[PDB]
């Protein structure tokens, strides 16, 4: 002691020890030599070096030996620390961040063939073993300090082949299959009924995967593809079908009432000058009073919304711009509707523009409700993705071009009416709508400076620019079908959470199952009831296996 | 498309003050005609706030003139 | 070979350069076409500004894209 | 459009090597700082006894599979 | 580009003679190895750099576009 355990005392390499050294190097007889003369097996490695990121150089396990042996897929090292006659390591012990060596395994996966093999392999070896050596003892629900089990932790970083392995878990071995999340509940000929364990997965009161993955970061290496894991599109699914597509029904209906009310509110606008304006004592007057009033309703509606979100979702300054475009839409609009009510009640005719501003938002803000249907919601995202990419770049390349052109142009006209920038821009822009003109004006010398100027423009622009917008638009489109699939499938689990978050009126029937015994009992006696999901599946090759069948007499 | 057309119309009408095209049928064929390449731009004054008239008209342009047939164009192609 | 085949916009910001200088010895020797020389440098300089494009991705690919279609697609079609 | 992809991506990489390199030969007022990387030491000596260091560039690989060659290595107490 | 990709990646783990290299490996811990690129003759010479003599090749050079794809390049002109 004290030279067996000897470690180093730069912050840099702090709590290294030889038994790390023996264990990184894949030495056994060494590791078993170090560990017979008494060296420590919960050292922990708290240097620099060994954390995760600060500093670009370094490793992570998990600082413990144990940690340090599972993340480099040492199986045998891994057993003989669990089970030596001379120090047995901890299996429950944590690091400085809480994490165990589950945390540890699912912090090293990075979504690769061969990685993801390894950590699954070593996940579910480590398990087992836990389970032989304390039946009694619950790996898989320790949280670590930001308090995440590792299921969590798997589903809030985008580990998808973790994730993928956790919930379709299937362990076939006499005294510790209570550990297995998927369950064979009974089997006729071909077609086996299954159990999926839907624990901490719709609701978990900390955080539901469901709830993690849909109100994940736009950082997420794999927000939009998580949702496709076997068990969670069929529940969402079934959510829908059992209550989410009537509400959702319901608040179009509602929305479309209130843009109707607003447009005939609108359009019959009183034409005498300075509001407020007196009330008439007519039926008209009255309807467009009423009508005014449910605007202005609906408008302080959609700004507490707006006001809601933003304070429970808390987005990041960076989520806020480059995620919610829905929200950020509806609060803007309501914005102007507020903005309107103000200028009309100070005397002023600028309730006008800003109310047609209004009325303009809200009629393009029902292409939200596209979601809800299939084919018009990936129409609505394709949309989305041509407006952020090609638009974009597009706009920017033609405004410096009509720009540039238009000033030439207003430069070389001596006087008369297109002597301004303003009027030259129009002229030069209604080429690009199919309606310009070549002789729209004579004041000027050098005719054929500006017939030169107008032929290269449109050659620039119409003949060139806008035909290969549509061929980048082409590809585009021939790009992103499964991203825009995944991404409508994103929206519609948001609208769901949503809606289960706040129910309609009071009615909380948003239960995923029934209540069954899928494995019997714990190792203990006692019984265990799951909430498991059943889904059916028929296979024809294999004819007949059924091991493990749960229940006799199928159906 | 009918969405569109439909909800920048009656923003654009309900702007205008009097005359010839304060009904929405009206504006509705006037903004109809930028899809076929017959757009005015200038088809009526009888308003305030001439910069509110243009920046509508211009989005209107952009979002379906711009992008939305040519989007079309590209969907019939992958068809 | 090089000169015409690679380096435009080189040649496109001398040739600006050309018509600016060409404008002021029109303007000293009182004659109106610096007017007309002027304008086209004008216009050759707003559409130079593309060169930056280089420096970001994306947009540095789209205007090497740009380029390409002049190049071969509206160079066929504008002779036929 | 479809077929000129990875043709656009490379020469717009040279592009931007070549404005990287102009920068490099005028730089901007006086400040040269424009050197590669450490100088380093990497295999030690020459056939003679005499060391030797190259200006190496630092790159940094994670690799799975082959867990462990560790072979040639310069240098103990990583990082 | 295939005898140029060969001579700049190039990793001898023969004694007495490593010194041939070009590729080190400066150290490993567990699955992650840092390597070091001799950058001689890469990006000054003061006769001609392989970066200066790709950037400044003539049209007709065969493979100028993808020269610069070699490895240790492309993140030398990223830093
Ligand atoms: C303007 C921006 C266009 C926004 C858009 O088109 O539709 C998002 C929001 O729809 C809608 O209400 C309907 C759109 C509105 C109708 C079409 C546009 C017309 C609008 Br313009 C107006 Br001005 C026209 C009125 C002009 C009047 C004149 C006034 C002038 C003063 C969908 O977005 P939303 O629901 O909220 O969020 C997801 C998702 O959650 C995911 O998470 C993430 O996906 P991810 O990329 O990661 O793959 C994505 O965000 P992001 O791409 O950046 O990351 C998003 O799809
Ligand atoms: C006109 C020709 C179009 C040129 C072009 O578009 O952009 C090159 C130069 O950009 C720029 O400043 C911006 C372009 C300019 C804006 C768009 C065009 C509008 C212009 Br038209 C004007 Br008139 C409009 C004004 C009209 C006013 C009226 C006046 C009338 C009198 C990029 O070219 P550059 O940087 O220099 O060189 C590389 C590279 O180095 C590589 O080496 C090699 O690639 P490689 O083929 O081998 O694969 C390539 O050359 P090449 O293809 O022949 O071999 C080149 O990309
Ligand atoms: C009283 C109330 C006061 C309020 C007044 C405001 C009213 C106006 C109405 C709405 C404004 C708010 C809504 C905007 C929200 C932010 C949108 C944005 O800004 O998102 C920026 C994006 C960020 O996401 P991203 O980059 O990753 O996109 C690719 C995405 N990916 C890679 C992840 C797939 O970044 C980009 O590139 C896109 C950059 C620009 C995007 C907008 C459209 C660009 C396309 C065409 C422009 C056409 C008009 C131009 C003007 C012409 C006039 C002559
Ligand atoms: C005071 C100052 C006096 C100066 C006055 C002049 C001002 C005018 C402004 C600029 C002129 C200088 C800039 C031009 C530089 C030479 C460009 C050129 O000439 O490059 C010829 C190319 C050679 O490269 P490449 O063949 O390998 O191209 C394919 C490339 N690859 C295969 C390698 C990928 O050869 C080709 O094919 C392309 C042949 C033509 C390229 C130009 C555009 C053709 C497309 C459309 C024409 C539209 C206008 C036609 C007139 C209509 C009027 C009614």
């Not at 939009?224 to 597509?245: A, S, T, Y």
């Amino acid at each position: 002691k004290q030279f067996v355990n000897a470690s180093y005392t730069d912050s840099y390499y702090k709590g290294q020890t030889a038994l790390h050294i023996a264990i990184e190097r894949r030495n056994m007889t060494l590791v078993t030599l170090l560990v017979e003369n008494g060296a420590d097996v919960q050292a922990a490695a708290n240097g620099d070096f060994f954390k995760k990121t600060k500093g670009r150089p370094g490793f992570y396990f998990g600082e413990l030996p144990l940690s340090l042996a599972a993340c480099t897929n040492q199986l045998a090292i891994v057993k003989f620390l669990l089970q030596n006659s001379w120090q047995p390591a901890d299996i429950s012990a944590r690091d400085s961040v809480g994490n165990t060596v589950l945390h540890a395994l699912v912090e090293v996966a990075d979504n690769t063939v061969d990685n993801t093999k390894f950590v699954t392999s070593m996940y579910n070896e480590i398990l087992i073993l836990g389970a032989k050596l304390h039946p009694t003892l619950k790996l898989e629900e320790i949280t670590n300090r930001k308090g995440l089990t590792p299921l969590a932790l798997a589903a809030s970083s985008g580990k998808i082949g973790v994730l993928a392995y956790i919930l379709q878990r299937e362990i076939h071995e006499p005294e510790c299959r209570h550990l297995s999340r998927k369950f064979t509940e009974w089997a006729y000929g071909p077609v086996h009924s299954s159990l999926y364990d839907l624990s901490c997965i719709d609701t978990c009161e900390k955080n539901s995967v469901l709830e993690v993955i849909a109100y994940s970061s736009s950082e997420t290496p794999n927000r939009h593809d998580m949702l496709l894991v076997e068990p969670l599109n069929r529940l969402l699914q079934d959510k829908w079908d059992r209550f989410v597509k009537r509400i959702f029904y319901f608040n179009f209906f509602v929305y479309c009432l209130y843009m109707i009310i607003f447009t005939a509110a609108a359009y019959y606008r009183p034409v005498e000058g300075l509001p407020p304006y007196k009330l008439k004592n007519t039926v008209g007057d009255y309807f467009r009073v009423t009508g005014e009033i449910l605007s202005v309703s609906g408008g302080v509606y959609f700004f507490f919304r707006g006001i809601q979100y933003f304070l429970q979702r808390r987005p990041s300054l960076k989520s806020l711009f480059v995620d919610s475009y829905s929200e950020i839409l509806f609060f803007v609009q309501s914005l102007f509707m507020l903005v309107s009510v103000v200028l009309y009640f100070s005397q002023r005719k600028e309730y006008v523009a800003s109310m047609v501003f209004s009325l303009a938002m809200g009629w393009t803000n029902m292409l939200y409700y596209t979601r809800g249907f299939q084919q018009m919601g990936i129409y609505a995202v394709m949309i989305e993705k041509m407006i952020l990419r090609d638009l974009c770049r597009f706009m920017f390349v033609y405004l410096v071009f009509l720009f540039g052109f238009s000033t030439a142009v207003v430069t070389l006209i001596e006087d008369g009416k297109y002597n301004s920038l303003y009027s030259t821009c129009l002229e030069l822009f209604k080429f690009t709508i199919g309606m310009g003109d070549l002789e729209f004006t004579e004041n000027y010398d050098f005719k054929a400076v500006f017939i030169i100027l107008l032929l290269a423009y449109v050659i620039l622009t119409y003949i060139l620019l806008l035909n290969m917008l549509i061929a980048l638009m082409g590809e585009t489109v021939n790009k992103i079908a499964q991203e825009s699939k995944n991404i409508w499938k994103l929206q519609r689990a948001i609208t769901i959470l949503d809606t289960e978050k706040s129910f309609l009126k009071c009615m909380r029937k948003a239960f995923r199952s029934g209540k069954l015994l899928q494995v019997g009992f714990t190792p203990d006696g006692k019984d265990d009831y799951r909430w498991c999901f059943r889904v059916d599946e028929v296979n024809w090759t294999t004819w007949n296996t059924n091991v493990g069948i749960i229940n006799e007499d199928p159906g």
